Amino acid sequence: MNLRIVSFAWQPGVLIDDDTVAPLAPMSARELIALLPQISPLISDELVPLDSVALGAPIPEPGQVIALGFNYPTHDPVVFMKSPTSISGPRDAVIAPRTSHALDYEIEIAVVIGKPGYRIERSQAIKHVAGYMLANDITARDVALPFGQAQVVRGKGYPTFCPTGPWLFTTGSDTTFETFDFELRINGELRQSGSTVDMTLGFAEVVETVSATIALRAGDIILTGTPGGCGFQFDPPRYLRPGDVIEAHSAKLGKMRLPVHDEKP
Amino acid sequence: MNLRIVSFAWQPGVLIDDDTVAPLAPMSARELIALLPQISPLISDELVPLDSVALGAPIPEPGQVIALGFNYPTHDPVVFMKSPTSISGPRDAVIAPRTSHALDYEIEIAVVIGKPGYRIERSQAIKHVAGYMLANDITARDVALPFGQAQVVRGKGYPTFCPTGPWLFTTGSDTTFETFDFELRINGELRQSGSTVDMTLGFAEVVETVSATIALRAGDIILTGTPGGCGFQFDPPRYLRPGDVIEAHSAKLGKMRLPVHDEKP
Ligand SMILES: [Cl-]
Ligand SMILES: [Cl-]
Ligand SMILES: [Cl-]
Ligand SMILES: [Cl-]
Ligand SMILES: [Cl-]
Ligand SMILES: [Cl-]
Ligand SMILES: [Mg+2]
Ligand SMILES: [Mg+2]
C-alpha cells in the first residue's frame, strides 16, 4: 500500500521494486496527489531500471514550500518559506550563486499535503498527508544574514536550493505517521545523521502548528527540520565547496546525489 | 490598450467603462496572463454594473507572493514572502486571528509577472510585467516579532492577509512603468498616502533585485512596498480594530473596502 511515486525528468512513475520502475499514466502531480487514496488500491492491486532513467522532483510545482527551523535539538520552531522555483530533483546540481561564499546543506524529511486544511487538529493531520519525500533546505547563510533586516527568503530561495526526491513515499493505509532514519554525506564523509524521533515537533504537530496560521492545499510541501552537523556549526566552517557531492540517504525514501558548482563572477 | 481585468467571485471580466464590466470568456488567470499581449489588441479592438457583481482577487492562485519591506523612506529593501493562501479579494473581510492583538495594514502597489524570468535586467523588467494591482501586506506584528527567531512568514501568511484588486491594470503598449498615487483610510480617516516616485527601488529595479535571487513565473505577484502611517508607528498604536473598515484607493487601480473582524477566543 505504501507506493513510491517518481517523476521522469510531466510523466509519473511507480517503483516496481527497489531497482526498477514503470510508467503509470497508461495504467498533474498535485492532481494525482488529490486522487491517490481511491486509486491507491487500484494501482497497488494492479501492480525499466531506476539507474537508467532521469528522475525529477516528485512534486515539481507545489503551491508553497514551508520549511521549519529549529525543529531538532542539535540544530519555538520557526516557520520559513522557500520559493517554489527553488524546487529541484534528486540528482540535480546545487548551484551556489555568485553572491554567496557560505552555502549550507540541511537534510530534512518533507511531508506532502494531500487534502486541503486550515487549523488541522493533531489527530487528523495524517488524513491530510499524501506522503513523504527526502529533501534539503539549502541556505546561503551570508545572504540570509548580511549583518549577523534578515534576508531569510533570499537565502533559502535561489534555484536549486530545494532538492527533493527521488520519490514520494505514500501513506497508503497508515493510521499514524512513520519513523525515518536519514543521513547526509559529502564526498562519502558523514555530515548529518538524524531520526524523526528527535523532532521537537513530530509530523502530526508540524501539520497542526503550520496549519494553525497557514491554509494548506494539496501539493504543498513542508520540510520538517534538519539535525546538527551543518556547515555553520564548525570552525573553520564546512560549507559546500565547488566539486563537493552531497549524498543523502534514507532507507524508505531513497538517495540523492547532488553535485555542487559555483557560478563564476 | 491598458485593460482592466477582474475576476467574478473562475470567470474573467474586463471593464467596459469605469462603472461597468463585461464577461470575457465568450468574447486560468495565470494562463490568461501568459496570453495577454497577443489578445490585448483583439480584446481591445473587439471592445453590467460594477456595483452589482461580486469581484474576487484578480490573480486567485499566484505561484508565489513576494512582498518588499523598507522600500519607502517613511516606512536595503527586505524580501518577504506571503503564503499564496493569504490572497483575498477587494471587498473581502480581513480576519484578525485569535493569536494577534497587533494587526497592521500596509497599502502597496503589486506587479504581476507575465513572462518568466531569472536575473532580469532592469531595462527588460517591463517585458515581464503583465500589469498592476492594488494590494495590502496585512501583518500581525506581535506574531511576526514574538520577542522584539522572527516569525515573519507566520505574521504575514494567515488567510485574508493579502487583499488584492479590484483589477489587474494591464501594461498594454507601455514601454516603461507607470506612476501611481494611492491612499488608505480607515473609517474615512486618512492613514497612508503614497506615490510610487518615493520608492527607493522603482518598479524596474524591484523586478531586477527580486529576480536576481528568485526565479519568477507568470502569475507571480510582487508587492512593492508601503509608505508610512502604519499602526505600529504611533503611540498609542493604530492597529486594526474589530469593526474598522479599510478603504484603499488609487485612480487607475480602483478601490478596496475591507471590513475587519476578530476571531473570537
Ligand atoms: Cl506539481
Ligand atoms: Cl503520529
Ligand atoms: Cl527510513
Ligand atoms: Cl490564478
Ligand atoms: Cl520605468
Ligand atoms: Cl493612480
Ligand atoms: Mg530548515
Ligand atoms: Mg510590505
Side-chain angles (χ1 to χ4, degrees), chain A residues 160-196:
Chain A
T160 81
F161 281 26
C162 199
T164 62
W167 57 71
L168 177 68
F169 176 80
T170 68
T171 51
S173 265
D174 298 358
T175 56
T176 56
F177 287 90
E178 299 207 15
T179 292
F180 306 84
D181 295 310
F182 52 97
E183 81 172 32
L184 182 147
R185 308 181 168 264
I186 291 173
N187 313 323
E189 183 182 6
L190 191 63
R191 300 304 190 79
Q192 305 188 272
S193 179
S195 171
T196 60

PDB file of all heavy atoms in Angstrom, chain A residues 160-196:
ATOM      1  N   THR A 160      17.607  25.685  -7.394  1.00  0.00           N
ATOM      2  CA  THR A 160      18.380  24.526  -6.921  1.00  0.00           C
ATOM      3  C   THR A 160      18.458  24.397  -5.402  1.00  0.00           C
ATOM      4  O   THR A 160      19.006  23.391  -4.917  1.00  0.00           O
ATOM      5  CB  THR A 160      19.799  24.393  -7.525  1.00  0.00           C
ATOM      6  OG1 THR A 160      20.748  25.253  -6.869  1.00  0.00           O
ATOM      7  CG2 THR A 160      19.825  24.645  -9.015  1.00  0.00           C
ATOM      8  N   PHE A 161      17.940  25.393  -4.659  1.00  0.00           N
ATOM      9  CA  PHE A 161      18.020  25.376  -3.193  1.00  0.00           C
ATOM     10  C   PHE A 161      17.008  24.453  -2.467  1.00  0.00           C
ATOM     11  O   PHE A 161      17.054  24.339  -1.238  1.00  0.00           O
ATOM     12  CB  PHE A 161      17.935  26.803  -2.620  1.00  0.00           C
ATOM     13  CG  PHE A 161      19.214  27.588  -2.687  1.00  0.00           C
ATOM     14  CD1 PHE A 161      20.186  27.328  -3.635  1.00  0.00           C
ATOM     15  CD2 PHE A 161      19.430  28.621  -1.787  1.00  0.00           C
ATOM     16  CE1 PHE A 161      21.368  28.072  -3.663  1.00  0.00           C
ATOM     17  CE2 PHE A 161      20.593  29.377  -1.822  1.00  0.00           C
ATOM     18  CZ  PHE A 161      21.549  29.113  -2.760  1.00  0.00           C
ATOM     19  N   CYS A 162      16.117  23.787  -3.192  1.00  0.00           N
ATOM     20  CA  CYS A 162      15.219  22.788  -2.567  1.00  0.00           C
ATOM     21  C   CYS A 162      15.191  21.461  -3.320  1.00  0.00           C
ATOM     22  O   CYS A 162      14.161  21.067  -3.901  1.00  0.00           O
ATOM     23  CB  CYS A 162      13.801  23.324  -2.387  1.00  0.00           C
ATOM     24  SG  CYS A 162      12.837  22.378  -1.152  1.00  0.00           S
ATOM     25  N   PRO A 163      16.330  20.758  -3.349  1.00  0.00           N
ATOM     26  CA  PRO A 163      16.334  19.394  -3.834  1.00  0.00           C
ATOM     27  C   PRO A 163      15.284  18.522  -3.133  1.00  0.00           C
ATOM     28  O   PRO A 163      15.091  18.637  -1.932  1.00  0.00           O
ATOM     29  CB  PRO A 163      17.749  18.903  -3.510  1.00  0.00           C
ATOM     30  CG  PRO A 163      18.568  20.116  -3.368  1.00  0.00           C
ATOM     31  CD  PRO A 163      17.648  21.163  -2.861  1.00  0.00           C
ATOM     32  N   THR A 164      14.618  17.661  -3.899  1.00  0.00           N
ATOM     33  CA  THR A 164      13.574  16.752  -3.384  1.00  0.00           C
ATOM     34  C   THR A 164      13.607  15.416  -4.134  1.00  0.00           C
ATOM     35  O   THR A 164      14.096  15.340  -5.278  1.00  0.00           O
ATOM     36  CB  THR A 164      12.150  17.343  -3.595  1.00  0.00           C
ATOM     37  OG1 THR A 164      11.885  17.509  -4.998  1.00  0.00           O
ATOM     38  CG2 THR A 164      11.987  18.673  -2.892  1.00  0.00           C
ATOM     39  N   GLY A 165      13.064  14.369  -3.501  1.00  0.00           N
ATOM     40  CA  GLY A 165      13.030  13.032  -4.107  1.00  0.00           C
ATOM     41  C   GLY A 165      14.112  12.110  -3.548  1.00  0.00           C
ATOM     42  O   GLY A 165      14.836  12.466  -2.610  1.00  0.00           O
ATOM     43  N   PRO A 166      14.284  10.944  -4.165  1.00  0.00           N
ATOM     44  CA  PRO A 166      13.786  10.594  -5.503  1.00  0.00           C
ATOM     45  C   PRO A 166      12.313  10.195  -5.640  1.00  0.00           C
ATOM     46  O   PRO A 166      11.835  10.052  -6.774  1.00  0.00           O
ATOM     47  CB  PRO A 166      14.694   9.416  -5.913  1.00  0.00           C
ATOM     48  CG  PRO A 166      15.162   8.819  -4.630  1.00  0.00           C
ATOM     49  CD  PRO A 166      15.272   9.985  -3.658  1.00  0.00           C
ATOM     50  N   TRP A 167      11.599   9.985  -4.538  1.00  0.00           N
ATOM     51  CA  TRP A 167      10.207   9.606  -4.678  1.00  0.00           C
ATOM     52  C   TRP A 167       9.319  10.083  -3.566  1.00  0.00           C
ATOM     53  O   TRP A 167       9.781  10.410  -2.474  1.00  0.00           O
ATOM     54  CB  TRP A 167      10.086   8.073  -4.883  1.00  0.00           C
ATOM     55  CG  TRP A 167      10.701   7.210  -3.812  1.00  0.00           C
ATOM     56  CD1 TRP A 167      10.244   7.044  -2.543  1.00  0.00           C
ATOM     57  CD2 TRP A 167      11.851   6.350  -3.934  1.00  0.00           C
ATOM     58  NE1 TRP A 167      11.053   6.186  -1.851  1.00  0.00           N
ATOM     59  CE2 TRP A 167      12.037   5.728  -2.681  1.00  0.00           C
ATOM     60  CE3 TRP A 167      12.747   6.061  -4.972  1.00  0.00           C
ATOM     61  CZ2 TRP A 167      13.079   4.834  -2.431  1.00  0.00           C
ATOM     62  CZ3 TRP A 167      13.771   5.174  -4.739  1.00  0.00           C
ATOM     63  CH2 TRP A 167      13.935   4.561  -3.472  1.00  0.00           C
ATOM     64  N   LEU A 168       8.033  10.180  -3.876  1.00  0.00           N
ATOM     65  CA  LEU A 168       7.004  10.342  -2.867  1.00  0.00           C
ATOM     66  C   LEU A 168       6.660   8.994  -2.293  1.00  0.00           C
ATOM     67  O   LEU A 168       6.109   8.142  -2.984  1.00  0.00           O
ATOM     68  CB  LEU A 168       5.757  10.990  -3.457  1.00  0.00           C
ATOM     69  CG  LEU A 168       4.547  11.158  -2.546  1.00  0.00           C
ATOM     70  CD1 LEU A 168       4.841  12.178  -1.474  1.00  0.00           C
ATOM     71  CD2 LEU A 168       3.317  11.636  -3.371  1.00  0.00           C
ATOM     72  N   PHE A 169       6.971   8.800  -1.019  1.00  0.00           N
ATOM     73  CA  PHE A 169       6.661   7.539  -0.330  1.00  0.00           C
ATOM     74  C   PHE A 169       5.289   7.749   0.266  1.00  0.00           C
ATOM     75  O   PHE A 169       5.128   8.574   1.189  1.00  0.00           O
ATOM     76  CB  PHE A 169       7.735   7.287   0.737  1.00  0.00           C
ATOM     77  CG  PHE A 169       7.494   6.080   1.596  1.00  0.00           C
ATOM     78  CD1 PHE A 169       7.808   4.808   1.141  1.00  0.00           C
ATOM     79  CD2 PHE A 169       6.995   6.212   2.879  1.00  0.00           C
ATOM     80  CE1 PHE A 169       7.600   3.690   1.939  1.00  0.00           C
ATOM     81  CE2 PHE A 169       6.800   5.100   3.684  1.00  0.00           C
ATOM     82  CZ  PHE A 169       7.094   3.847   3.224  1.00  0.00           C
ATOM     83  N   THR A 170       4.274   7.114  -0.298  1.00  0.00           N
ATOM     84  CA  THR A 170       2.902   7.417   0.112  1.00  0.00           C
ATOM     85  C   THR A 170       2.513   6.818   1.468  1.00  0.00           C
ATOM     86  O   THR A 170       3.117   5.860   1.970  1.00  0.00           O
ATOM     87  CB  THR A 170       1.855   6.979  -0.920  1.00  0.00           C
ATOM     88  OG1 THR A 170       1.826   5.549  -0.962  1.00  0.00           O
ATOM     89  CG2 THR A 170       2.193   7.577  -2.301  1.00  0.00           C
ATOM     90  N   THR A 171       1.488   7.424   2.052  1.00  0.00           N
ATOM     91  CA  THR A 171       0.980   6.997   3.357  1.00  0.00           C
ATOM     92  C   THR A 171       0.197   5.711   3.268  1.00  0.00           C
ATOM     93  O   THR A 171       0.106   4.946   4.243  1.00  0.00           O
ATOM     94  CB  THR A 171       0.144   8.115   3.993  1.00  0.00           C
ATOM     95  OG1 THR A 171      -0.836   8.574   3.043  1.00  0.00           O
ATOM     96  CG2 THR A 171       1.028   9.281   4.329  1.00  0.00           C
ATOM     97  N   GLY A 172      -0.367   5.435   2.097  1.00  0.00           N
ATOM     98  CA  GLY A 172      -1.148   4.230   1.911  1.00  0.00           C
ATOM     99  C   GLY A 172      -2.209   4.077   2.986  1.00  0.00           C
ATOM    100  O   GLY A 172      -3.023   4.990   3.192  1.00  0.00           O
ATOM    101  N   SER A 173      -2.144   2.940   3.683  1.00  0.00           N
ATOM    102  CA  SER A 173      -3.094   2.532   4.721  1.00  0.00           C
ATOM    103  C   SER A 173      -2.687   2.914   6.160  1.00  0.00           C
ATOM    104  O   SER A 173      -3.374   2.521   7.118  1.00  0.00           O
ATOM    105  CB  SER A 173      -3.306   1.013   4.651  1.00  0.00           C
ATOM    106  OG  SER A 173      -4.453   0.689   3.873  1.00  0.00           O
ATOM    107  N   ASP A 174      -1.620   3.703   6.319  1.00  0.00           N
ATOM    108  CA  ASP A 174      -1.094   4.028   7.654  1.00  0.00           C
ATOM    109  C   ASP A 174      -2.126   4.832   8.463  1.00  0.00           C
ATOM    110  O   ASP A 174      -2.759   5.741   7.944  1.00  0.00           O
ATOM    111  CB  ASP A 174       0.191   4.875   7.572  1.00  0.00           C
ATOM    112  CG  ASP A 174       1.356   4.177   6.874  1.00  0.00           C
ATOM    113  OD1 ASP A 174       1.260   3.011   6.453  1.00  0.00           O
ATOM    114  OD2 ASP A 174       2.403   4.850   6.742  1.00  0.00           O
ATOM    115  N   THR A 175      -2.283   4.525   9.743  1.00  0.00           N
ATOM    116  CA  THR A 175      -3.163   5.330  10.611  1.00  0.00           C
ATOM    117  C   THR A 175      -2.397   6.342  11.455  1.00  0.00           C
ATOM    118  O   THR A 175      -3.004   7.215  12.109  1.00  0.00           O
ATOM    119  CB  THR A 175      -4.008   4.434  11.531  1.00  0.00           C
ATOM    120  OG1 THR A 175      -3.153   3.580  12.314  1.00  0.00           O
ATOM    121  CG2 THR A 175      -4.947   3.596  10.692  1.00  0.00           C
ATOM    122  N   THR A 176      -1.066   6.244  11.417  1.00  0.00           N
ATOM    123  CA  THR A 176      -0.205   7.188  12.094  1.00  0.00           C
ATOM    124  C   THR A 176       0.953   7.540  11.169  1.00  0.00           C
ATOM    125  O   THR A 176       1.098   6.976  10.077  1.00  0.00           O
ATOM    126  CB  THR A 176       0.373   6.606  13.378  1.00  0.00           C
ATOM    127  OG1 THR A 176       1.050   5.387  13.059  1.00  0.00           O
ATOM    128  CG2 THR A 176      -0.718   6.348  14.412  1.00  0.00           C
ATOM    129  N   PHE A 177       1.776   8.479  11.597  1.00  0.00           N
ATOM    130  CA  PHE A 177       2.976   8.819  10.831  1.00  0.00           C
ATOM    131  C   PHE A 177       4.053   7.775  11.049  1.00  0.00           C
ATOM    132  O   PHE A 177       4.053   7.069  12.065  1.00  0.00           O
ATOM    133  CB  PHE A 177       3.483  10.222  11.205  1.00  0.00           C
ATOM    134  CG  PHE A 177       2.611  11.310  10.667  1.00  0.00           C
ATOM    135  CD1 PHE A 177       1.545  11.786  11.406  1.00  0.00           C
ATOM    136  CD2 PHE A 177       2.802  11.794   9.376  1.00  0.00           C
ATOM    137  CE1 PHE A 177       0.716  12.729  10.908  1.00  0.00           C
ATOM    138  CE2 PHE A 177       1.942  12.736   8.864  1.00  0.00           C
ATOM    139  CZ  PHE A 177       0.917  13.223   9.640  1.00  0.00           C
ATOM    140  N   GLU A 178       4.930   7.643  10.063  1.00  0.00           N
ATOM    141  CA  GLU A 178       6.024   6.703  10.124  1.00  0.00           C
ATOM    142  C   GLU A 178       7.255   7.393  10.685  1.00  0.00           C
ATOM    143  O   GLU A 178       7.281   8.610  10.897  1.00  0.00           O
ATOM    144  CB  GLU A 178       6.335   6.124   8.738  1.00  0.00           C
ATOM    145  CG  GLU A 178       5.161   5.354   8.106  1.00  0.00           C
ATOM    146  CD  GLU A 178       5.599   4.287   7.129  1.00  0.00           C
ATOM    147  OE1 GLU A 178       6.794   3.916   7.116  1.00  0.00           O
ATOM    148  OE2 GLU A 178       4.730   3.778   6.396  1.00  0.00           O
ATOM    149  N   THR A 179       8.231   6.570  10.991  1.00  0.00           N
ATOM    150  CA  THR A 179       9.523   6.998  11.502  1.00  0.00           C
ATOM    151  C   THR A 179      10.564   6.788  10.405  1.00  0.00           C
ATOM    152  O   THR A 179      10.497   5.801   9.649  1.00  0.00           O
ATOM    153  CB  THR A 179       9.793   6.204  12.766  1.00  0.00           C
ATOM    154  OG1 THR A 179       8.843   6.641  13.761  1.00  0.00           O
ATOM    155  CG2 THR A 179      11.216   6.380  13.284  1.00  0.00           C
ATOM    156  N   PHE A 180      11.506   7.740  10.298  1.00  0.00           N
ATOM    157  CA  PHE A 180      12.602   7.639   9.338  1.00  0.00           C
ATOM    158  C   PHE A 180      13.950   7.894   9.978  1.00  0.00           C
ATOM    159  O   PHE A 180      14.060   8.675  10.928  1.00  0.00           O
ATOM    160  CB  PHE A 180      12.413   8.631   8.207  1.00  0.00           C
ATOM    161  CG  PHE A 180      11.101   8.512   7.564  1.00  0.00           C
ATOM    162  CD1 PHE A 180      10.014   9.149   8.117  1.00  0.00           C
ATOM    163  CD2 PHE A 180      10.919   7.717   6.448  1.00  0.00           C
ATOM    164  CE1 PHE A 180       8.783   9.033   7.556  1.00  0.00           C
ATOM    165  CE2 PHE A 180       9.676   7.582   5.897  1.00  0.00           C
ATOM    166  CZ  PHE A 180       8.611   8.249   6.448  1.00  0.00           C
ATOM    167  N   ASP A 181      14.963   7.201   9.470  1.00  0.00           N
ATOM    168  CA  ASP A 181      16.352   7.467   9.854  1.00  0.00           C
ATOM    169  C   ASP A 181      17.059   7.921   8.613  1.00  0.00           C
ATOM    170  O   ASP A 181      16.901   7.326   7.564  1.00  0.00           O
ATOM    171  CB  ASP A 181      17.014   6.212  10.405  1.00  0.00           C
ATOM    172  CG  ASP A 181      16.381   5.750  11.706  1.00  0.00           C
ATOM    173  OD1 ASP A 181      16.211   6.588  12.639  1.00  0.00           O
ATOM    174  OD2 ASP A 181      16.037   4.556  11.796  1.00  0.00           O
ATOM    175  N   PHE A 182      17.842   8.983   8.703  1.00  0.00           N
ATOM    176  CA  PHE A 182      18.388   9.558   7.481  1.00  0.00           C
ATOM    177  C   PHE A 182      19.797  10.091   7.705  1.00  0.00           C
ATOM    178  O   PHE A 182      20.147  10.487   8.819  1.00  0.00           O
ATOM    179  CB  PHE A 182      17.443  10.646   6.933  1.00  0.00           C
ATOM    180  CG  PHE A 182      17.057  11.691   7.956  1.00  0.00           C
ATOM    181  CD1 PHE A 182      17.720  12.888   8.009  1.00  0.00           C
ATOM    182  CD2 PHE A 182      16.083  11.431   8.919  1.00  0.00           C
ATOM    183  CE1 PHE A 182      17.383  13.855   8.954  1.00  0.00           C
ATOM    184  CE2 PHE A 182      15.749  12.395   9.908  1.00  0.00           C
ATOM    185  CZ  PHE A 182      16.406  13.594   9.925  1.00  0.00           C
ATOM    186  N   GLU A 183      20.588  10.134   6.640  1.00  0.00           N
ATOM    187  CA  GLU A 183      21.932  10.662   6.732  1.00  0.00           C
ATOM    188  C   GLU A 183      22.335  11.460   5.518  1.00  0.00           C
ATOM    189  O   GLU A 183      21.878  11.206   4.422  1.00  0.00           O
ATOM    190  CB  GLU A 183      22.923   9.524   6.966  1.00  0.00           C
ATOM    191  CG  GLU A 183      23.314   8.758   5.703  1.00  0.00           C
ATOM    192  CD  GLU A 183      24.442   7.768   5.952  1.00  0.00           C
ATOM    193  OE1 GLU A 183      24.519   7.224   7.073  1.00  0.00           O
ATOM    194  OE2 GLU A 183      25.252   7.556   5.023  1.00  0.00           O
ATOM    195  N   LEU A 184      23.217  12.430   5.737  1.00  0.00           N
ATOM    196  CA  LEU A 184      23.826  13.179   4.675  1.00  0.00           C
ATOM    197  C   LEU A 184      25.355  13.105   4.782  1.00  0.00           C
ATOM    198  O   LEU A 184      25.921  13.265   5.879  1.00  0.00           O
ATOM    199  CB  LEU A 184      23.329  14.628   4.749  1.00  0.00           C
ATOM    200  CG  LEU A 184      23.826  15.593   3.675  1.00  0.00           C
ATOM    201  CD1 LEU A 184      22.763  16.672   3.321  1.00  0.00           C
ATOM    202  CD2 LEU A 184      25.188  16.257   4.073  1.00  0.00           C
ATOM    203  N   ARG A 185      25.988  12.810   3.647  1.00  0.00           N
ATOM    204  CA  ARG A 185      27.414  12.730   3.483  1.00  0.00           C
ATOM    205  C   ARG A 185      27.819  13.697   2.384  1.00  0.00           C
ATOM    206  O   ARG A 185      27.036  14.023   1.512  1.00  0.00           O
ATOM    207  CB  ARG A 185      27.877  11.318   3.059  1.00  0.00           C
ATOM    208  CG  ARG A 185      27.361  10.233   3.934  1.00  0.00           C
ATOM    209  CD  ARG A 185      27.838   8.841   3.524  1.00  0.00           C
ATOM    210  NE  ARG A 185      27.528   7.886   4.584  1.00  0.00           N
ATOM    211  CZ  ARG A 185      28.365   7.491   5.546  1.00  0.00           C
ATOM    212  NH1 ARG A 185      29.642   7.908   5.604  1.00  0.00           N
ATOM    213  NH2 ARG A 185      27.920   6.638   6.452  1.00  0.00           N
ATOM    214  N   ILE A 186      29.066  14.127   2.432  1.00  0.00           N
ATOM    215  CA  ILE A 186      29.668  14.927   1.377  1.00  0.00           C
ATOM    216  C   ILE A 186      30.974  14.264   1.009  1.00  0.00           C
ATOM    217  O   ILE A 186      31.818  14.051   1.872  1.00  0.00           O
ATOM    218  CB  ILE A 186      29.876  16.355   1.807  1.00  0.00           C
ATOM    219  CG1 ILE A 186      28.511  17.051   1.947  1.00  0.00           C
ATOM    220  CG2 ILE A 186      30.785  17.105   0.741  1.00  0.00           C
ATOM    221  CD1 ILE A 186      28.600  18.481   2.549  1.00  0.00           C
ATOM    222  N   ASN A 187      31.080  13.869  -0.270  1.00  0.00           N
ATOM    223  CA  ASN A 187      32.173  13.047  -0.757  1.00  0.00           C
ATOM    224  C   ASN A 187      32.411  11.812   0.109  1.00  0.00           C
ATOM    225  O   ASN A 187      33.537  11.449   0.364  1.00  0.00           O
ATOM    226  CB  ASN A 187      33.444  13.917  -0.871  1.00  0.00           C
ATOM    227  CG  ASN A 187      33.175  15.231  -1.565  1.00  0.00           C
ATOM    228  OD1 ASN A 187      32.369  15.300  -2.530  1.00  0.00           O
ATOM    229  ND2 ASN A 187      33.801  16.299  -1.074  1.00  0.00           N
ATOM    230  N   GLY A 188      31.326  11.167   0.561  1.00  0.00           N
ATOM    231  CA  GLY A 188      31.435   9.930   1.303  1.00  0.00           C
ATOM    232  C   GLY A 188      31.561  10.140   2.804  1.00  0.00           C
ATOM    233  O   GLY A 188      31.342   9.208   3.577  1.00  0.00           O
ATOM    234  N   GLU A 189      31.941  11.341   3.225  1.00  0.00           N
ATOM    235  CA  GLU A 189      32.075  11.640   4.660  1.00  0.00           C
ATOM    236  C   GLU A 189      30.743  11.997   5.328  1.00  0.00           C
ATOM    237  O   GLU A 189      29.994  12.883   4.841  1.00  0.00           O
ATOM    238  CB  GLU A 189      33.029  12.785   4.851  1.00  0.00           C
ATOM    239  CG  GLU A 189      33.287  13.134   6.287  1.00  0.00           C
ATOM    240  CD  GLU A 189      34.207  14.315   6.398  1.00  0.00           C
ATOM    241  OE1 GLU A 189      34.536  14.927   5.335  1.00  0.00           O
ATOM    242  OE2 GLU A 189      34.580  14.641   7.551  1.00  0.00           O
ATOM    243  N   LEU A 190      30.482  11.375   6.482  1.00  0.00           N
ATOM    244  CA  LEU A 190      29.260  11.682   7.226  1.00  0.00           C
ATOM    245  C   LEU A 190      29.257  13.130   7.745  1.00  0.00           C
ATOM    246  O   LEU A 190      30.213  13.538   8.408  1.00  0.00           O
ATOM    247  CB  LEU A 190      29.067  10.701   8.374  1.00  0.00           C
ATOM    248  CG  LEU A 190      27.712  10.718   9.080  1.00  0.00           C
ATOM    249  CD1 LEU A 190      26.583  10.331   8.136  1.00  0.00           C
ATOM    250  CD2 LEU A 190      27.748   9.801  10.308  1.00  0.00           C
ATOM    251  N   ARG A 191      28.217  13.899   7.410  1.00  0.00           N
ATOM    252  CA  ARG A 191      27.992  15.213   8.000  1.00  0.00           C
ATOM    253  C   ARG A 191      26.809  15.205   8.979  1.00  0.00           C
ATOM    254  O   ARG A 191      26.893  15.738  10.091  1.00  0.00           O
ATOM    255  CB  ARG A 191      27.739  16.286   6.922  1.00  0.00           C
ATOM    256  CG  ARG A 191      28.893  16.496   5.903  1.00  0.00           C
ATOM    257  CD  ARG A 191      30.221  16.838   6.554  1.00  0.00           C
ATOM    258  NE  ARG A 191      31.200  17.246   5.549  1.00  0.00           N
ATOM    259  CZ  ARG A 191      31.268  18.439   4.962  1.00  0.00           C
ATOM    260  NH1 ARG A 191      30.416  19.407   5.239  1.00  0.00           N
ATOM    261  NH2 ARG A 191      32.200  18.653   4.068  1.00  0.00           N
ATOM    262  N   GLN A 192      25.675  14.663   8.545  1.00  0.00           N
ATOM    263  CA  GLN A 192      24.474  14.705   9.363  1.00  0.00           C
ATOM    264  C   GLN A 192      23.869  13.342   9.500  1.00  0.00           C
ATOM    265  O   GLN A 192      23.844  12.590   8.547  1.00  0.00           O
ATOM    266  CB  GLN A 192      23.411  15.627   8.757  1.00  0.00           C
ATOM    267  CG  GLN A 192      23.837  17.040   8.475  1.00  0.00           C
ATOM    268  CD  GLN A 192      22.653  17.913   8.055  1.00  0.00           C
ATOM    269  OE1 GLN A 192      22.317  17.992   6.860  1.00  0.00           O
ATOM    270  NE2 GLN A 192      21.986  18.520   9.031  1.00  0.00           N
ATOM    271  N   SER A 193      23.294  13.068  10.670  1.00  0.00           N
ATOM    272  CA  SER A 193      22.614  11.798  10.917  1.00  0.00           C
ATOM    273  C   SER A 193      21.431  12.092  11.837  1.00  0.00           C
ATOM    274  O   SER A 193      21.620  12.672  12.931  1.00  0.00           O
ATOM    275  CB  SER A 193      23.564  10.774  11.554  1.00  0.00           C
ATOM    276  OG  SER A 193      22.861   9.556  11.797  1.00  0.00           O
ATOM    277  N   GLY A 194      20.219  11.773  11.375  1.00  0.00           N
ATOM    278  CA  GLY A 194      19.046  12.014  12.174  1.00  0.00           C
ATOM    279  C   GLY A 194      18.037  10.889  12.144  1.00  0.00           C
ATOM    280  O   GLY A 194      18.083   9.999  11.277  1.00  0.00           O
ATOM    281  N   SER A 195      17.165  10.940  13.143  1.00  0.00           N
ATOM    282  CA  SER A 195      15.966  10.128  13.261  1.00  0.00           C
ATOM    283  C   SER A 195      14.787  11.072  13.573  1.00  0.00           C
ATOM    284  O   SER A 195      14.902  11.976  14.396  1.00  0.00           O
ATOM    285  CB  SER A 195      16.136   9.154  14.418  1.00  0.00           C
ATOM    286  OG  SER A 195      14.926   8.456  14.731  1.00  0.00           O
ATOM    287  N   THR A 196      13.630  10.842  12.960  1.00  0.00           N
ATOM    288  CA  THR A 196      12.483  11.702  13.217  1.00  0.00           C
ATOM    289  C   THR A 196      11.971  11.645  14.683  1.00  0.00           C
ATOM    290  O   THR A 196      11.206  12.514  15.109  1.00  0.00           O
ATOM    291  CB  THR A 196      11.361  11.431  12.190  1.00  0.00           C
ATOM    292  OG1 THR A 196      10.943  10.066  12.276  1.00  0.00           O
ATOM    293  CG2 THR A 196      11.902  11.768  10.749  1.00  0.00           C
TER     294      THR A 196
END
